[PDB]
Design a protein around this nucleic acid. Sequence first.
DNA 1: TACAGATTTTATGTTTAGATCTTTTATGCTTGCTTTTCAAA
DNA 2: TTTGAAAAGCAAGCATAAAAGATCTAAACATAAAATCTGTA
Lengths: 51, 254, 85, 554
Amino acid sequence: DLSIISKYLLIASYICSYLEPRYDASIFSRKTRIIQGRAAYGRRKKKEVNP
Amino acid sequence: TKSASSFLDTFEGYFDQRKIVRTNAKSRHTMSMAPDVTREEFSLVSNFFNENFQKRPRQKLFEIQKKMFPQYWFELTQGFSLLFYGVGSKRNFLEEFAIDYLSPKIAYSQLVNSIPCLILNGYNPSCNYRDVFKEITDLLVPAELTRSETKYWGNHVILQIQKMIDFYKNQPLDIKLILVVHNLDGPSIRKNTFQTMLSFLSVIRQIAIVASTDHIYAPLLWDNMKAQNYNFVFHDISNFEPSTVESTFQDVMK
Amino acid sequence: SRTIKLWLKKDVKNVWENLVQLDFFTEKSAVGLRDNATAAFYASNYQFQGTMIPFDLRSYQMQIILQELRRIIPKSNMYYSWTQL
Amino acid sequence: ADAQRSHYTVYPSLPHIPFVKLLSGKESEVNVEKRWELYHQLHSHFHDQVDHIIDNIEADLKAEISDLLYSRCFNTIFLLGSDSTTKIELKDESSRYNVLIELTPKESPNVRMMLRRSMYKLYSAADAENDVSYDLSLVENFKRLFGKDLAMVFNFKDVDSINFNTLDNFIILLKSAFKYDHVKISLIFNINTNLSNIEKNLRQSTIRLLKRNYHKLDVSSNKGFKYGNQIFQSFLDTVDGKLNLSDRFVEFILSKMANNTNHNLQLLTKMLDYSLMSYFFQNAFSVFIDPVNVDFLNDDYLKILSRCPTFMFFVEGLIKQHAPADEILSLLLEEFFVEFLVRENPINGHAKFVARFLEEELNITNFNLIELYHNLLIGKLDSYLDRWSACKEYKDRLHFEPIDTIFQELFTLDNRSGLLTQSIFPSYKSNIEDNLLSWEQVLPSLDSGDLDKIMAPVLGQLFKLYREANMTINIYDFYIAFRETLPKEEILNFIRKDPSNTKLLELAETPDAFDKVALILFMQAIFAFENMGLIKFQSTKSYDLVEKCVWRGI
DNA sequence: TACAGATTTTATGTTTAGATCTTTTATGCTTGCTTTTCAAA
DNA sequence: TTTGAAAAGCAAGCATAAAAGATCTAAACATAAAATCTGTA
């Protein structure tokens, strides 16, 4: 019995708590570029411990 | 130092501006290369620019904002607390609205002295909630707690305000006190006990609440219960005012 | 792979609480039982961070190490081979 | 100085309604007072029903808790979505003290304080209708002191806020009273989140103890929509025959009501109230919801009402259907305005009809009357009734097409200006960002006129460079970037405009004058940014670098 | 003046709110090497 | 269609911020006997 905003804020807080903040542009960035640039490439090799 | 980022706004700009700068790409520029400025010339140039730069548009804008004063009065008579926000100082606006306008209107409509206005300087870090409630108890003379109402090492201020809420629900709905809170998100008034005290006072229909906020994250202070008790109507009043009174408690040299 | 019932998480929570209660586990950097009544009074008015996070994330330390378990657990036990790494 | 004080009281100097004169100030004061009194009867008629509904919520909820509380273990009640405001009643049951104990997390820092407050309240309540120790031996000696049996009802308020180790140890402490034959204990838990979040924080033996007899009770106002429908129906019967509700307004009500779950009814009351205040403050036609004001027609009323699009459509349909032009020019009205403001508008009574038919004739209770009213407004009531698979035979009886009546735009509650959004649910930090970035929508551009014309205000000029920068900003490079935007000559002319100030004139002829002025303005704007929360010094004793904290459009 | 009763003074115990300092751990900066997508031929 | 090359990634080492709490103080809350002050008598 939580609100829709409370539910997505809980999901986003879990994502912020368990994803390191240097690869978010490799997942969430989607918008068309007018200026030349590169987003984050992503994580190179996977970790073998579930965070 | 304009960023070499493709994006400026939203989460796109947030993720695009938080990238990694190399050591050779950083600038080792310090404050020692800045021109030396003493306190007196700082004061002189600031009071010159704060009294002559963009003064006429600020004056005309302020004359537009007092056409909102009857609507503010009407929102206060229906039980809503006023929250003002914007860019610049709102202190002169709040005292001019509450003292020169609102208190004579409330006093004349309730027909001989005017309504007392209790001012809280929340920009002052020494703003103390117990002394504010001491002034409130002198202004309103509430009934003291009996022995069963003191509970067991309870907070006497909060219990007295709850007794006040239960008392004032069966009174005529005439405003007896105007509580002006400059900088409701200030350094000591933003604490949980002060906010709880002020929201429970905002429950009482006989106290008019006119508050202002300066921090960009001020609505984080209020949960569902405090938003219900505060009963805010929000009004954006941006004026680009100097805010020289509130700057006396910080050090401008740093 | 080389049968034993695998128990679920909700059932293993009770076994975990019984192992904590029997002092096989110990909370990380826990002082425990204070020396004098004044220190215990000071501790009783403090809200420890371990008591607010969920139980599955609490850090714990062993009161008995794996080598000691290999010393005491008999050879005929079906989990004796996992007392070595 | 009072400005440097913590608090001070001003006894203002006294040298009559807040409603203003409309029709560009040409409205009479009689119409202003009649609008005031009309708003007061509508507001009183709505709020009397709202107070009665809230009292009925309290009474029925105490009745449900009293039923569940009565008729060697704890008697456990879990109140889900409680918010812990209700006063729980216990009966008078002879030869037995029924003592009710409220505990909050603030009153519960440890188990010792819980027991001491509980036994002090128990002893005080037993004495109210020789000192003792405030411990559990008061419970075992209760029949020796007072002569009657004991029934303790513990009410834990805000269970999602109390430390769960303390609460577990307190329940284990209260387990010790089961060996006394004159004691029964009931526990009431005000659960706000859900029951699965509570049992993952309690130990398994405590859950096994609590499992012997427990009752769940959904005590939310959202359950069944039974209390929201009464408030919305009370607002409908207040404005029935006087005001209409737009589909935009009802959709706004539903969208805002979804975003708040624990406090839904007073948000709905606040939104409907503010819409009523806005209508009675902005509209001069509000006096025409009373039929006795039809002699108050003036010219400005006619030119305001002639711009209605329903009137526009009606007269273009009239020129479509009527060939001669003499009858068209006669209408282009005062007598035609009166005969249509007395129409019944039976959508409210029909909404009540389908509400009582769904509730008391088909035994269907899980409907939102606000959503049903929105579907009746948009014309899709059948697409709302084809869900329960029982209104198929009654699909043709409950048919209603919307009638877009003439001059309903002067009597309606809408939101096409965003006033309800700007006042009740504003985009606070977005408004601050947009006032900082643009600033020509705040300060007027009047046509020191030159420096006001060609130089921005300092906070907006700082924000324009702040937004285009990186996360980490060098302060000296920020000051260099800010100094380039400023005019080096017009500022030095501006500080020489006043010949009375001599020290500023002396500082103006310094060869390092403009950089000093730029650094003073830059530092004042930087500390304004620091107080607003826009920047942060990532240090303690250097203050050479700052970190951006706020992004526009988030 | 006499004296019961109310208030003050002095003295101490109970509980909560907050400050300061210590110890251990997270976190960010630097520097050198390695992978990877996009601007250009 | 390549290509190459600068942006991104990664990790070892280290200086430093900061979390957690041990320890303590002071204010609010609470009680209580002896002395002292008040109001009648």
